[PDB]
Amino acid sequence: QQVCPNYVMLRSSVTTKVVRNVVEYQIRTGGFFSCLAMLRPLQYAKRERLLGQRNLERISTRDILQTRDLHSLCMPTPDAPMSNHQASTMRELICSYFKVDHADGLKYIPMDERYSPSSLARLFTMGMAGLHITTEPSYKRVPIMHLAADLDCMTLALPYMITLDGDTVVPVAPTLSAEQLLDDGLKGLACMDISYGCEMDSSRCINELYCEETAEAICVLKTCLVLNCMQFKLEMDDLAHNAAELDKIQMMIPFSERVFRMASSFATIDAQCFRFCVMMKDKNLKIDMRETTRLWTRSASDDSVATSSLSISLDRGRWVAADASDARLLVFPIRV
Ligand SMILES: C[C@H](CCC(=O)NCC(=O)O)[C@H]1CC[C@H]2[C@@H]3[C@H](O)C[C@@H]4C[C@H](O)CC[C@]4(C)[C@H]3C[C@H](O)[C@]12C
Ligand SMILES: C[C@H](CCC(=O)NCC(=O)O)[C@H]1CC[C@H]2[C@@H]3[C@H](O)C[C@@H]4C[C@H](O)CC[C@]4(C)[C@H]3C[C@H](O)[C@]12C
Protein backbone atom coordinates (compact mmCIF):
# COMPACT_ATOMS: atom_id res chain seq x y z
CA GLN A 1 0.00 0.00 0.00
CA GLN A 2 1.59 3.24 -1.24
CA VAL A 3 1.58 6.33 1.02
CA CYS A 4 2.88 9.71 -0.09
CA PRO A 5 3.97 8.50 -3.54
CA ASN A 6 5.38 11.91 -4.56
CA TYR A 7 7.08 12.77 -1.23
CA VAL A 8 10.77 12.14 -0.53
CA MET A 9 10.88 11.40 3.21
CA LEU A 10 7.26 10.55 3.93
CA ARG A 11 7.24 8.09 0.98
CA SER A 12 6.15 4.85 2.67
CA SER A 13 4.50 1.51 2.00
CA VAL A 14 2.15 -0.43 4.29
CA THR A 15 1.66 -4.21 4.17
CA THR A 16 -1.31 -5.63 6.11
CA LYS A 17 -2.01 -9.31 6.74
CA VAL A 18 -4.29 -11.70 8.59
CA VAL A 19 -3.16 -14.96 10.24
CA ARG A 20 -6.14 -16.73 11.87
CA ASN A 21 -8.19 -13.54 12.12
CA VAL A 22 -5.48 -11.46 13.87
CA VAL A 23 -4.83 -7.95 12.54
CA GLU A 24 -1.20 -7.28 11.53
CA TYR A 25 0.49 -4.08 10.27
CA GLN A 26 3.87 -3.37 8.67
CA ILE A 27 5.06 0.13 7.70
CA ARG A 28 7.94 0.51 5.23
CA THR A 29 9.49 3.96 5.55
CA GLY A 30 11.58 4.36 2.43
CA GLY A 31 13.10 7.68 1.46
CA PHE A 32 13.40 8.63 5.12
CA PHE A 33 15.91 5.94 6.03
CA SER A 34 17.73 6.73 2.77
CA CYS A 35 18.00 10.36 3.83
CA LEU A 36 19.43 9.73 7.31
CA ALA A 37 22.01 7.32 5.91
CA MET A 38 23.65 10.46 4.45
CA LEU A 39 25.35 10.87 7.88
CA ARG A 40 27.79 8.26 6.49
CA PRO A 41 28.52 9.55 3.03
CA LEU A 42 30.51 6.55 1.77
CA GLN A 43 27.91 4.09 3.02
CA TYR A 44 25.22 6.03 1.09
CA ALA A 45 27.18 6.08 -2.18
CA LYS A 46 28.43 2.47 -1.67
CA ARG A 47 25.30 1.34 -3.51
CA GLU A 48 25.42 3.66 -6.54
CA ARG A 49 29.21 3.71 -6.76
CA LEU A 50 29.03 0.34 -8.59
CA LEU A 51 26.18 1.38 -10.92
CA GLY A 52 27.23 3.06 -14.15
CA GLN A 53 25.94 6.19 -15.80
CA ARG A 54 23.20 4.23 -17.58
CA ASN A 55 21.56 4.21 -14.11
CA LEU A 56 20.82 7.94 -14.62
CA GLU A 57 20.50 8.19 -18.40
CA ARG A 58 17.51 5.79 -18.39
CA ILE A 59 15.86 8.10 -15.82
CA SER A 60 16.16 11.42 -17.66
CA THR A 61 14.89 9.31 -20.61
CA ARG A 62 11.39 9.12 -19.11
CA ASP A 63 8.74 11.84 -19.45
CA ILE A 64 6.72 10.75 -16.39
CA LEU A 65 9.63 12.15 -14.28
CA GLN A 66 7.87 11.91 -10.88
CA THR A 67 9.52 12.61 -7.52
CA ARG A 68 11.65 9.50 -6.92
CA ASP A 69 13.47 10.08 -10.23
CA LEU A 70 14.05 13.80 -9.86
CA HIS A 71 15.52 13.06 -6.42
CA SER A 72 17.97 10.51 -7.84
CA LEU A 73 18.96 13.20 -10.36
CA CYS A 74 19.25 15.85 -7.57
CA MET A 75 16.82 18.14 -9.41
CA PRO A 76 13.97 20.30 -8.08
CA THR A 77 10.79 18.31 -7.40
CA PRO A 78 7.41 19.68 -8.47
CA ASP A 79 4.50 17.55 -7.29
CA ALA A 80 6.31 17.77 -3.94
CA PRO A 81 6.99 20.51 -1.38
CA MET A 82 9.96 22.79 -2.02
CA SER A 83 11.77 25.59 -0.24
CA ASN A 84 13.39 28.87 -1.20
CA HIS A 85 15.15 29.60 2.10
CA GLN A 86 18.61 31.06 1.43
CA ALA A 87 18.46 29.52 -2.06
CA SER A 88 20.91 32.21 -3.17
CA THR A 89 23.36 31.07 -0.51
CA MET A 90 22.88 27.36 -1.28
CA ARG A 91 23.56 27.94 -4.97
CA GLU A 92 26.85 29.63 -4.07
CA LEU A 93 27.76 26.54 -2.05
CA ILE A 94 27.17 24.14 -4.96
CA CYS A 95 29.42 26.23 -7.18
CA SER A 96 32.14 26.28 -4.51
CA TYR A 97 32.02 22.65 -3.41
CA PHE A 98 31.81 21.20 -6.93
CA LYS A 99 33.84 24.11 -8.41
CA VAL A 100 31.42 24.72 -11.26
CA ASP A 101 30.01 27.75 -13.06
CA HIS A 102 26.88 29.71 -12.18
CA ALA A 103 25.18 28.39 -15.33
CA ASP A 104 25.37 24.90 -13.79
CA GLY A 105 24.34 26.06 -10.30
CA LEU A 106 21.16 27.36 -11.92
CA LYS A 107 20.41 23.78 -13.05
CA TYR A 108 20.23 22.67 -9.41
CA ILE A 109 18.53 25.85 -8.14
CA PRO A 110 16.34 27.49 -10.85
CA MET A 111 15.54 31.21 -11.14
CA ASP A 112 12.45 30.28 -9.09
CA GLU A 113 14.86 29.52 -6.18
CA ARG A 114 12.56 26.61 -5.33
CA TYR A 115 14.40 23.35 -4.69
CA SER A 116 14.01 20.12 -2.75
CA PRO A 117 16.16 20.13 0.42
CA SER A 118 16.69 16.33 0.29
CA SER A 119 17.81 16.60 -3.35
CA LEU A 120 20.63 18.96 -2.29
CA ALA A 121 21.65 16.78 0.68
CA ARG A 122 21.90 13.82 -1.67
CA LEU A 123 23.98 15.93 -4.03
CA PHE A 124 26.34 17.11 -1.32
CA THR A 125 26.45 13.75 0.46
CA MET A 126 27.25 12.06 -2.87
CA GLY A 127 29.79 14.82 -3.40
CA MET A 128 31.53 14.06 -0.11
CA ALA A 129 31.63 10.40 -1.19
CA GLY A 130 33.58 11.45 -4.28
CA LEU A 131 30.80 11.39 -6.87
CA HIS A 132 29.35 14.54 -8.44
CA ILE A 133 25.91 14.09 -9.97
CA THR A 134 26.14 16.49 -12.90
CA THR A 135 23.51 18.57 -14.67
CA GLU A 136 23.36 16.30 -17.73
CA PRO A 137 22.97 12.65 -16.58
CA SER A 138 26.47 11.60 -15.38
CA TYR A 139 28.59 10.61 -12.37
CA LYS A 140 31.90 12.48 -12.26
CA ARG A 141 34.68 11.53 -9.84
CA VAL A 142 35.65 14.20 -7.30
CA PRO A 143 37.92 14.01 -4.23
CA ILE A 144 36.66 11.77 -1.44
CA MET A 145 36.54 13.72 1.81
CA HIS A 146 38.72 12.23 4.53
CA LEU A 147 35.95 12.97 7.03
CA ALA A 148 33.57 10.65 5.18
CA ALA A 149 36.14 7.88 5.51
CA ASP A 150 36.80 8.76 9.18
CA LEU A 151 33.11 8.17 9.97
CA ASP A 152 32.54 5.12 7.79
CA CYS A 153 32.84 2.70 10.72
CA MET A 154 30.36 4.47 12.97
CA THR A 155 26.89 2.99 13.40
CA LEU A 156 25.40 5.58 15.80
CA ALA A 157 25.11 9.34 15.38
CA LEU A 158 23.39 11.80 17.74
CA PRO A 159 23.14 15.42 16.53
CA TYR A 160 22.56 18.07 19.19
CA MET A 161 22.81 21.79 19.86
CA ILE A 162 25.38 23.19 22.28
CA THR A 163 26.21 26.40 24.06
CA LEU A 164 28.54 27.44 26.89
CA ASP A 165 27.34 28.16 30.40
CA GLY A 166 30.91 29.07 31.43
CA ASP A 167 33.74 26.78 30.32
CA THR A 168 31.92 23.54 29.42
CA VAL A 169 30.35 22.57 26.11
CA VAL A 170 26.87 21.85 27.44
CA PRO A 171 23.91 20.54 25.41
CA VAL A 172 20.79 22.75 25.06
CA ALA A 173 17.27 22.53 23.75
CA PRO A 174 16.82 23.97 20.28
CA THR A 175 15.70 27.60 20.23
CA LEU A 176 15.64 27.98 16.45
CA SER A 177 14.32 25.98 13.59
CA ALA A 178 16.79 24.02 11.48
CA GLU A 179 16.03 26.45 8.66
CA GLN A 180 17.73 29.36 10.48
CA LEU A 181 21.07 27.57 10.88
CA LEU A 182 21.69 27.70 7.11
CA ASP A 183 21.56 31.47 6.93
CA ASP A 184 24.17 34.00 8.03
CA GLY A 185 26.95 32.29 6.07
CA LEU A 186 25.96 28.96 7.68
CA LYS A 187 27.54 30.32 10.86
CA GLY A 188 24.73 28.92 12.98
CA LEU A 189 26.19 25.47 12.35
CA ALA A 190 29.07 26.14 14.73
CA CYS A 191 26.72 25.45 17.62
CA MET A 192 25.68 22.04 16.28
CA ASP A 193 27.60 18.91 17.19
CA ILE A 194 27.15 15.30 16.11
CA SER A 195 28.33 12.51 18.41
CA TYR A 196 29.26 9.30 16.58
CA GLY A 197 29.88 5.91 18.10
CA CYS A 198 30.23 2.17 17.60
CA GLU A 199 28.10 -0.67 19.01
CA MET A 200 27.18 4.38 22.73
CA ASP A 201 30.68 3.06 23.34
CA SER A 202 33.41 4.60 21.10
CA SER A 203 31.91 8.08 21.33
CA ARG A 204 33.77 10.62 19.13
CA CYS A 205 32.26 14.03 18.38
CA ILE A 206 32.43 15.47 14.88
CA ASN A 207 33.51 18.80 16.42
CA GLU A 208 36.54 16.96 17.91
CA LEU A 209 37.67 16.12 14.36
CA TYR A 210 37.89 19.84 13.51
CA CYS A 211 40.82 20.43 11.17
CA GLU A 212 41.63 22.95 8.48
CA GLU A 213 41.28 20.05 5.99
CA THR A 214 38.05 18.64 7.35
CA ALA A 215 36.30 21.96 8.12
CA GLU A 216 34.81 22.04 4.60
CA ALA A 217 33.50 18.47 4.84
CA ILE A 218 32.38 18.86 8.46
CA CYS A 219 30.16 21.81 7.49
CA VAL A 220 28.60 19.97 4.52
CA LEU A 221 27.69 16.98 6.74
CA LYS A 222 25.90 19.38 9.03
CA THR A 223 24.22 21.18 6.14
CA CYS A 224 22.93 17.89 4.74
CA LEU A 225 21.38 17.09 8.14
CA VAL A 226 19.69 20.48 8.32
CA LEU A 227 18.40 20.11 4.76
CA ASN A 228 16.85 16.70 5.47
CA CYS A 229 15.10 18.36 8.43
CA MET A 230 13.73 21.03 6.11
CA GLN A 231 12.38 18.36 3.77
CA PHE A 232 10.66 16.59 6.65
CA LYS A 233 9.16 19.82 7.92
CA LEU A 234 7.98 20.74 4.41
CA GLU A 235 6.25 17.40 3.94
CA MET A 236 4.54 17.48 7.35
CA ASP A 237 3.30 21.01 6.55
CA ASP A 238 2.03 19.80 3.16
CA LEU A 239 0.62 16.53 4.51
CA ALA A 240 -1.42 18.61 6.99
CA HIS A 241 -3.46 20.30 4.22
CA ASN A 242 -3.50 17.29 1.86
CA ALA A 243 -6.77 16.14 3.40
CA ALA A 244 -7.04 13.59 0.57
CA GLU A 245 -3.76 11.80 1.29
CA LEU A 246 -4.28 12.33 5.04
CA ASP A 247 -7.56 10.39 4.91
CA LYS A 248 -5.77 7.25 3.68
CA ILE A 249 -4.20 6.77 7.13
CA GLN A 250 -6.00 9.10 9.58
CA MET A 251 -6.80 6.20 11.94
CA MET A 252 -3.61 4.14 11.53
CA ILE A 253 -2.21 4.67 15.03
CA PRO A 254 0.99 2.59 14.49
CA PHE A 255 1.88 5.22 11.85
CA SER A 256 1.75 8.12 14.31
CA GLU A 257 4.36 6.32 16.39
CA ARG A 258 6.47 6.02 13.24
CA VAL A 259 6.18 9.71 12.40
CA PHE A 260 7.17 10.39 16.03
CA ARG A 261 10.41 8.43 15.55
CA MET A 262 11.10 10.37 12.36
CA ALA A 263 10.77 13.77 14.05
CA SER A 264 12.88 12.47 16.96
CA SER A 265 15.78 12.42 14.51
CA PHE A 266 15.50 16.21 14.33
CA ALA A 267 14.20 16.93 17.84
CA THR A 268 17.61 18.25 19.02
CA ILE A 269 18.31 20.70 16.14
CA ASP A 270 14.81 21.98 15.30
CA ALA A 271 12.63 23.67 17.92
CA GLN A 272 9.43 22.70 16.16
CA CYS A 273 10.41 19.03 15.94
CA PHE A 274 11.39 19.23 19.62
CA ARG A 275 8.05 20.61 20.78
CA PHE A 276 6.15 18.28 18.42
CA CYS A 277 7.84 15.18 19.86
CA VAL A 278 7.38 16.44 23.45
CA MET A 279 3.64 16.86 22.94
CA MET A 280 3.22 13.30 21.67
CA LYS A 281 4.96 11.61 24.59
CA ASP A 282 2.59 13.58 26.83
CA LYS A 283 -0.22 11.83 24.97
CA ASN A 284 1.62 8.44 25.08
CA LEU A 285 1.82 8.11 21.26
CA LYS A 286 -1.72 6.61 20.89
CA ILE A 287 -2.85 9.27 18.43
CA ASP A 288 -4.69 9.39 15.09
CA MET A 289 -2.65 10.69 12.19
CA ARG A 290 -5.26 13.42 11.79
CA GLU A 291 -4.70 14.58 15.37
CA THR A 292 -0.93 14.19 14.91
CA THR A 293 -1.22 16.57 11.97
CA ARG A 294 -2.96 19.04 14.29
CA LEU A 295 -0.12 18.66 16.81
CA TRP A 296 2.40 19.29 14.04
CA THR A 297 0.64 22.51 13.04
CA ARG A 298 0.32 23.40 16.76
CA SER A 299 4.03 22.99 17.39
CA ALA A 300 4.74 25.92 15.06
CA SER A 301 3.80 28.19 18.00
CA ASP A 302 6.77 28.82 20.28
CA ASP A 303 4.56 28.79 23.37
CA SER A 304 3.07 25.41 22.37
CA VAL A 305 5.32 23.74 25.00
CA ALA A 306 7.36 25.19 27.85
CA THR A 307 10.87 24.46 26.56
CA SER A 308 12.35 27.04 28.94
CA SER A 309 11.42 25.02 32.03
CA LEU A 310 13.21 21.85 30.79
CA SER A 311 16.70 20.75 31.78
CA ILE A 312 18.80 19.32 28.93
CA SER A 313 21.71 16.91 29.35
CA LEU A 314 23.32 13.84 27.79
CA ASP A 315 23.65 10.44 29.45
CA ARG A 316 24.75 7.09 27.98
CA GLY A 317 24.76 8.39 24.40
CA ARG A 318 21.09 9.54 24.45
CA TRP A 319 19.54 13.05 24.62
CA VAL A 320 17.28 13.93 27.52
CA ALA A 321 14.76 16.73 28.15
CA ALA A 322 13.37 16.64 31.68
CA ASP A 323 12.09 18.52 34.69
CA ALA A 324 10.55 17.87 38.12
CA SER A 325 11.78 14.30 38.79
CA ASP A 326 10.20 13.17 35.50
CA ALA A 327 11.72 13.09 32.00
CA ARG A 328 9.65 14.45 29.08
CA LEU A 329 11.64 13.29 26.04
CA LEU A 330 14.35 10.71 25.32
CA VAL A 331 16.01 10.91 21.90
CA PHE A 332 18.14 7.98 20.89
CA PRO A 333 21.00 8.15 18.39
CA ILE A 334 20.30 7.65 14.69
CA ARG A 335 21.18 4.26 13.22
CA VAL A 336 23.84 4.71 10.50
C1 LIG B 1 29.49 27.65 21.94
C2 LIG B 1 30.40 28.81 21.50
C3 LIG B 1 29.61 30.15 21.51
C4 LIG B 1 29.16 30.63 22.90
C5 LIG B 1 27.73 30.21 23.11
O6 LIG B 1 27.48 29.34 23.95
N7 LIG B 1 26.86 30.77 22.26
C8 LIG B 1 25.60 30.14 21.94
C9 LIG B 1 24.80 30.96 20.96
O10 LIG B 1 25.25 31.14 19.81
O11 LIG B 1 23.70 31.44 21.33
C12 LIG B 1 31.00 28.56 20.12
C13 LIG B 1 31.58 29.89 19.54
C14 LIG B 1 32.92 29.60 18.91
C15 LIG B 1 32.80 28.08 18.69
C16 LIG B 1 34.05 27.33 18.17
C17 LIG B 1 34.59 28.03 16.93
O18 LIG B 1 33.55 28.34 15.98
C19 LIG B 1 35.69 27.22 16.23
C20 LIG B 1 35.30 25.75 16.04
C21 LIG B 1 34.31 25.68 14.87
C22 LIG B 1 33.78 24.29 14.58
O23 LIG B 1 32.68 24.38 13.66
C24 LIG B 1 33.33 23.60 15.87
C25 LIG B 1 34.46 23.63 16.90
C26 LIG B 1 34.82 25.05 17.32
C27 LIG B 1 35.94 24.93 18.34
C28 LIG B 1 33.66 25.88 17.92
C29 LIG B 1 32.99 25.27 19.16
C30 LIG B 1 31.77 26.07 19.66
O31 LIG B 1 30.72 26.04 18.66
C32 LIG B 1 32.14 27.51 19.97
C33 LIG B 1 33.05 27.45 21.21
C1 LIG C 1 33.45 26.73 6.54
C2 LIG C 1 33.91 26.11 5.21
C3 LIG C 1 35.41 25.78 5.30
C4 LIG C 1 36.34 26.96 5.58
C5 LIG C 1 37.74 26.38 5.68
O6 LIG C 1 38.28 25.92 4.72
N7 LIG C 1 38.48 26.43 6.75
C8 LIG C 1 38.34 27.45 7.76
C9 LIG C 1 39.46 27.44 8.82
O10 LIG C 1 39.82 26.31 9.22
O11 LIG C 1 40.00 28.51 9.27
C12 LIG C 1 33.66 27.01 3.97
C13 LIG C 1 34.27 26.46 2.68
C14 LIG C 1 33.45 27.06 1.53
C15 LIG C 1 32.48 28.03 2.22
C16 LIG C 1 31.21 28.49 1.47
C17 LIG C 1 31.53 29.04 0.07
O18 LIG C 1 32.63 29.94 0.15
C19 LIG C 1 30.38 29.80 -0.59
C20 LIG C 1 29.60 30.73 0.37
C21 LIG C 1 30.42 32.01 0.64
C22 LIG C 1 29.79 32.99 1.63
O23 LIG C 1 30.81 33.93 1.99
C24 LIG C 1 29.27 32.30 2.89
C25 LIG C 1 28.43 31.07 2.51
C26 LIG C 1 29.15 30.03 1.66
C27 LIG C 1 28.09 28.97 1.31
C28 LIG C 1 30.43 29.47 2.36
C29 LIG C 1 30.17 28.89 3.76
C30 LIG C 1 31.43 28.35 4.44
O31 LIG C 1 32.26 29.46 4.82
C32 LIG C 1 32.20 27.36 3.56
C33 LIG C 1 31.34 26.08 3.39
Task: Give strand pairing partners of 329.
Answer: 321
Tell me the resolution in Å. 3.2
Report CA(222)–ligand 1 centroid distance (Å): 14
Helix axes 253-264, 271-282, angle to 10 degrees: 140
Any residues with CB less than 8 A from the CB of 266 and at least 6 apart, and which? 178, 228, 229, 232, 233, 273
Q: What is the C-alpha separation between 254 and 331, in angstroms, rounded?
A: 19
Contact 188, 176 (CB under 8 A): yes
Report CA(205)–ligand 2 centroid distance (Å): 21
CA angle 189, 311, 170 (to 5 degrees): 40
Output the ligand 1 site: residues, CB below 6 A.
162-164, 190-191, 207, 210
Q: Could you count the other beta carbons within 10 Å of the beta carbon of residue 334?
A: 20
Task: Give strand pairing partners of 204.
Answer: 196
Q: Whose CA is nearest to atom 32 of ligand 2?
A: 216
- What single DSSP character describes residue 83? B
Helix then strand then coil, in percent of the chain rounded to 5, is: 45, 20, 35
Output the ligand 2 site: residues, CB below 6 A.
89, 92-93, 96, 185-186, 212, 215-216, 219
Which ligand has the shortest distance to the CA of 215? 2
Which ligand has the shortest distance to the CA of 212? 2
Q: What is the C-alpha separation between 3 and 239, in angstroms, rounded?
A: 11
Experimental method: X-ray
Q: What is the C-alpha separation between 301 and 297, in angstroms, rounded?
A: 8
Closest CA to 188 of 115, 114, 267, 270: 270
76-to-69, 114, 120, 194 alpha-carbon distances in Å: 10, 7, 9, 28
DSSP alpha helix (H) spans, the chain: 30-36, 41-48, 54-60, 66-72, 87-97, 102-108, 117-128, 146-150, 215-241, 243-246, 253-264, 271-282, 289-299
